[PDB]
Design a protein around this ligand. Structure first.
Ligand SMILES: N#Cc1ccc(Cn2cnc3ccccc32)cc1
Ligand SMILES: [Zn+2]
Ligand SMILES: [Zn+2]
Ligand SMILES: [Zn+2]
Length: 585
């Protein structure tokens, strides 16, 4: 027994063809089954034929005959159908409202999540459907990982470098940081974990969650996890207040946090508030300042990633009493300067998926472009707070959608929070970039921030662009442009100061070629989010939807504190780069 995801109408039926098995009310369960291929229906039992060696599972072909279900062929003389009168048979048959349409719920139940349209619906539908879609999507994602063949150690060529043998009759996953494996040592009668791992073409380069002497026979699978069902909505109901509520502001604050005093007061006068923090605008500074602004307030800092939580801790450690902080870790090496797993501590830093059930004066959820509606609902489920603050930048990168191919995902559709910020705008905006040369701030202010992002720094006059399509080659799941690395090699011979530069591209394979040929440190745009470097060399590599994503581009070029070279493929973004152009040698 449970609740109709469309009606909430109390019900005893769950669709058994739905990977999540949502409770559906007599009306909704029927409208679902007759309007899709979903025809298996589960109650306190499964509406299948209890006839010895029959295969009938279609509820539209089955009859209650006794207290046992039968198809046409096996039914007793006395039986009534399970599925008739616009209703499917179970408990609570007289309490059942239905819906005008069930069309949206069917799409969510039946979509393969390869089309942007699927994520658009999942974010424009009613809230209980946002939860259903988010479970359905996450479970589809976890199951899709199993589809991938096991990788086994055939040889150990060196340290840091391996030979892999791959399971026949199953695709192999892309070998980039988005795909995190778990290794396993072959044992007596079973297997035991041996840390997590990531791989990259050689043979294959492996960067593991610990060191070992891993030998032949050790194998790797993308560890999938159980997706629990969602209860809480993605956003609580907004409330606006006429005074600050439940928070006591400090009388004496430092001039370091003085620029956020207005914003901190906003945070005290609504239930939840959205803060858009462009690159190098002081999001963590803002997040920690709030503590000092509300000294007695219990604050739970959360983000999706251990990295994002650890950065909050690093900042905390520079301003908040250490004895008043705890880092929450479930039984990967993360921040270890606070007492560990102390939930009643005044400042609690903790990934979403590891959050305890607890209350707080404020909840700060950071790096919000990267949250899914799944993570959103989890926080509202785990954390009951007087105020919720959502800090991120919907102009930056979202969580990868491993299943998505047909369409690009716009920021309004990354999650409920980014939807709000891109539709009703953000409650709060950090409009001064302290990181980047002016030429890079002018460029992204125009590109994605409506000319509201202002440069602290002056022009560096070390921001350059080059239009060079060169030559694109493809390997199994990535792109290479050797002539764009050539141009950069030739640029470095003539500008050797630029050998302190970080190399950034949209493709881990470009990065690997570049690392060999140039010896610069490499980052994918996606791995670079949240890091800064004085000098950045950027090869677009291709003009794909991927390599022209305006959010990826925004992140690529705002990594530079001083200078950047952008070797561009796309004539559109080359022309939006407010940078000194350079000719081709
Ligand atoms: N869609 C939807 C949906 C709306 C409300 C609830 C009631 N509920 C349960 N847990 C909650 C936490 C915070 C706030 C409300 C909450 C459940 C699902
Ligand atoms: Zn179904
Ligand atoms: Zn219903
Ligand atoms: Zn039968």
């Amino acid at each position: 027994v449970g609740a109709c995801v469309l009606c909430n109408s109390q019900t005893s039926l769950r669709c058994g063809a739905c990977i999540r098995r949502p409770f559906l009310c007599c009306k909704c369960c029927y409208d679902h089954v007759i309007s899709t291929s979903h025809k298996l229906v589960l109650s306190v039992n499964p509406y299948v034929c209890n006839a010895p060696g029959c295969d009938v599972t279609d509820v539209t072909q089955l009859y209650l005959g006794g207290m046992s279900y039968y198809c046409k062929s096996h039914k007793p003389p006395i039986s009534f159908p399970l599925c008739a009168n616009g209703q499917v048979f179970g408990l609570y048959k007289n309490t059942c409202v239905g819906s005008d349409n069930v069309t949206d719920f069917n799409a969510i139940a039946t979509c393969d999540w390869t089309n942007a349209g699927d994520y658009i619906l999942a974010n424009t539908c009613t809230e209980r459907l946002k939860l259903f879609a988010a479970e359905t999507l996450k479970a589809t994602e976890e199951t899709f990982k199993l589809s991938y063949g096991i990788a086994t150690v055939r040889e150990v060529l060196s340290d840091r470098e391996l030979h892999l043998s791959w399971e026949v009759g199953k695709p192999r996953p892309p070998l980039n940081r988005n795909y995190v494996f778990t290794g396993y040592r072959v044992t007596k009668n079973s297997k035991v974990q041996i840390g997590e791992y990531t791989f990259e073409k050689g043979a294959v380069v492996y960067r593991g969650t610990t060191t070992y002497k891993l030998n032949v026979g050790d194998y790797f699978v993308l560890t999938s996890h159980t997706v629990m069902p969602l209860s809480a909505p993605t956003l609580v109901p907004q409330e606006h207040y006429v005074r600050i509520t439940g928070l006591y502001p400090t009388l004496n604050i430092s001039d370091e946090f003085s620029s956020n005093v207005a914003n901190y007061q906003k945070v005290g006068m609504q239930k939840y508030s959205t803060l858009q923090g462009p690159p190098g605008t002081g999001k963590s500074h803002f997040a920690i300042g709030l503590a000092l602004y509300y000294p007695s307030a219990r604050i739970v800092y959360t983000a999706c990633s251990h990295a994002a939580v650890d950065a909050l801790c690093e900042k905390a450690l520079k301003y908040l009493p250490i004895d008043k902080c705890s880092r929450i870790i479930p039984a990967v090496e993360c921040f270890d300067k606070f007492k560990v797993n102390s939930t009643l501590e005044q400042y609690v830093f903790c990934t979403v998926n590891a959050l305890p059930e607890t209350t707080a004066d404020i909840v700060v959820f950071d790096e919000i472009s990267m949250a899914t509606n799944y993570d959103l609902s989890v926080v509202n489920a785990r954390l009951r707070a007087k105020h919720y603050v959502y800090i991120g930048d919907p102009a930056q990168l979202p969580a990868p959608r491993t299943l998505l191919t047909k369409g690009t995902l716009e920021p309004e559709y990354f999650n409920s929070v980014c939807r709000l910020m891109k539709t009703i705008g953000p409650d709060m905006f950090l409009g001064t970039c302290r990181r980047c040369p002016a030429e890079i701030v002018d460029t992204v202010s125009a590109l994605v921030y409506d000319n509201k992002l202002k440069a602290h720094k002056d022009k560096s006059a070390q921001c350059f662009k080059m239009f060079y399509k060169g030559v694109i080659t493809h390997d199994v799941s990535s792109a290479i442009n050797r002539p764009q690395i050539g141009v950069v090699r030739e640029f470095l011979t003539r500008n050797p100061a630029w050998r302190k530069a970080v190399f950034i591209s949209p493709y881990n394979s470009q990065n690997a070629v570049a690392s060999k040929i140039l010896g610069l440190p490499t980052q994918t745009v996606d791995s670079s989010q949240g890091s800064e470097y004085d000098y950045v060399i950027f090869t677009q590599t291709t003009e794909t939807a991927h390599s022209c994503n305006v959010n990826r581009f925004n992140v690529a070029i705002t990594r530079a504190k001083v200078g950047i070279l952008c070797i561009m493929s796309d004539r559109d973004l080359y022309d939006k780069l407010q940078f000194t152009s350079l000719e081709i040698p």
